[PDB]
Amino acid sequence: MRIPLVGKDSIESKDIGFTLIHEHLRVFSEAVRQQWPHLYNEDEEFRNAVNEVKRAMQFGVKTIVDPTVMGLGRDIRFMEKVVKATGINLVAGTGIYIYIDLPFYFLNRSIDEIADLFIHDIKEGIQGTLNKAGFVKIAADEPGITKDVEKVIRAAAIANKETKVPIITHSNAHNNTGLEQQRILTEEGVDPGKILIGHLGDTDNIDYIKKIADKGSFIGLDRYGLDLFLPVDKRNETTLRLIKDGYSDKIMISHDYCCTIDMGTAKPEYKPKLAPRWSITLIFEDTIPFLKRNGVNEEVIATIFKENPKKFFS
Amino acid sequence: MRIPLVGKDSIESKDIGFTLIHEHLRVFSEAVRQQWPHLYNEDEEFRNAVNEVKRAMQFGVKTIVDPTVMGLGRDIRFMEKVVKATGINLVAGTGIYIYIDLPFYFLNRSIDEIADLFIHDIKEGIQGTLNKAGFVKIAADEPGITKDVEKVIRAAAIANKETKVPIITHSNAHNNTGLEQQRILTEEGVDPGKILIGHLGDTDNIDYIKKIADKGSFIGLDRYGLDLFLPVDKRNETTLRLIKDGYSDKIMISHDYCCTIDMGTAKPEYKPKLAPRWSITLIFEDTIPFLKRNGVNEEVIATIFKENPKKFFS
Ligand SMILES: [Co+2]
Ligand SMILES: [Co+2]
Ligand SMILES: [Fe+2]
Ligand SMILES: [Fe+2]
């Protein structure tokens, strides 16, 4: 059809339905898990992911896009288990997630070599399976656009032009990395409407967010629940403002929730402090009702969670 | 019963025999191999490692110390397959190999949690097996002693003090990282004679190397064949000079040979220029005969390849 799904036949974009554009079933450092498996519990990770997905589906979620890639512990076999146990539409991706340098493997390897890896996942399949990647994920954070971060961005552009799959990014909302990602990608021939600039919800700087949307890319208000980056009420005020200003056409919303994450920051005794209400269904429990209370109609909600994702994968 | 071996009973350190203190059976980036297995061929890797180790045993090598740790693709099960096919004494280690930052797993984690990881490998076993680590490996390079790099160094100190296993390091011969590693470790209470400061053979700056040995640590003239860091003839000159100046009892010699390495820098095309005669037996073909034809007696060669490793692990 058009959009590949983990453990299912691919579907036309018209069948995506209500979508969460940025959620993680599970995240871990590949090297750590590989060297110290005693630190992880496969059964527990599985129960948590299955339980989260089931609750999301009870609110009407039909598709989840999971941008777990190299550097975040992408595991296509774990994903297909969750799919088999829930019946969710799951879009997996390919890409590379780094802030500074690439793994030593890429020393003296061209940008084309890197792009070949993405294209392989898109055309052949992921990690020895026939499950194909439906988008490319790239990142940049506090260190900005370093040389290697820039190789990865250009590689994504190459993969997009060859395969037409969209691009999701991770960025730091406070240092201009999002704007730079969009610039570099679009200068390399990527259609701006095929890019989602991520974690823009981490800021309340409306002008910066409009600046990116105005250049034709989707804007990721995609960390709902992560108060440490920005409280739910601040995000809500920003989201409502953008909607009132007529930016529904570019807004995408999600939680960036990790049904499991191995970071030292994601410890249970830090949850009440940094992400008390953080879950894969927080937007149903708070954000969406807040928007409706403030005069946002059902057409707008549908545009954000249905039409936008559809255009993005079309 | 003192030095753990992979796939064998532990040995007394006095039984170690002729030893190669720094060689790799296989090296790769965990994240890359995990996300793109299509890039690797395990049969070739296994065949290459077995062939190299067998040729090494033909030259009288009894023991090989393999500092492949997190970040370099340590794989204890691959290692025991190689032992079963060769009968070599193989010492595995634990530790972390980074130049700049630690994997995100380590955000908000203490130096002690890191040490616990090393201590787990040494006392419990590696990757779910009963094969135990016989030393701790750490690294620092061009980027220098970063915060994360230092945290790892200090973790290694804790592990040494708890388990008594020696410490092997990777350093950059031109930026003082070696001397820094030695300083931080000794300050933390690590016996200098329990430290092998690695890759010092990459420079002909005899003064720098001597300073480190004078501080009481072993010096790694351990990259024989890697001409891109320093040609074999210049290495041999430094080695011979250090021996004549009476540093035999602090010198350790090796190849740092990777029977298989995944990085593009060390791939077939560049080998003829960067490392034309680089293998696990180069020192028997070139280095040792050079030393012996230049007034180095058999007692000195035994001190370097038998006595020094014995002390290091005592
Ligand atoms: Co992100
Ligand atoms: Co090294
Ligand atoms: Fe994410
Ligand atoms: Fe090495």
Residue numbers in the entry:
A (entry chain A), B (entry chain C): 1 to 314
Quote the original article.
Compared to wild-type SsoPox, variants W263L, W263M and W263F are the most efficient at improving specific activities, ranging from 30-50 and 20-35-fold at 1 mM and 100 µM, respectively. These variants constitute the Phosphotriesterase Selected Variants group (PteSV). Variant W263F is the most proficient (kcat/KM = 1.21 (±0.26)x104 M-1s-1), followed by W263M and W263L with increased efficiencies of 23.3, 14.1 and 4.6-fold, respectively, as compared to wild-type enzyme. Regarding the PteSV group, while these variants exhibit higher phosphotriesterase activity, they demonstrate mild improvements for the oxo-lactones and no or wild-type-like AHLase activity (W263L-M and W263F, respectively). Notably, contrary to the wild-type enzyme, all selected variants (with the exception of W263F) exhibit a substrate inhibition for undecanoic-δ-lactones with KI values ranging between 789 ± 186 µM and 7 400 ± 2 475 µM, respectively, for the W263V and W263M variants. The analysis of the normalized B-factors of the variants clearly reveal that the substitution W263 is destabilizing (as confirmed by the Tm of the variants), but also that the active site loops of PteSV are significantly more disordered than those of LacSV. PteSV lose their activity before the loss of the global structure (Tm), whereas LacSV do not, and exhibit a similar thermophilicity profile to that of the wild-type enzyme. These data strongly suggest that the increased disorder in loop 8 caused by the PteSV substitutions collapses the loop as the temperature increase, whereas it does not occur with the LacSV.
PLLs are natural lactonases endowed with promiscuous phosphotriesterase activity. The catalytic center contained two metal cations coordinated by four histidines, an aspartic acid and a carboxylated lysine residue. A structural analysis of SsoPox, a hyperthermostable counterpart of the PLL family from Sulfolobus solfataricus, has revealed that loop 7 is shorter in SsoPox than in PTEs; linking the active site to the loop 8, which forms a hydrophobic channel that accommodates AHLs aliphatic chain. Indeed, W263 is located at the start of loop 8, involved in the dimer interface of the enzyme and positions the lactone cycle of the substrate onto the bi-metallic catalytic center.
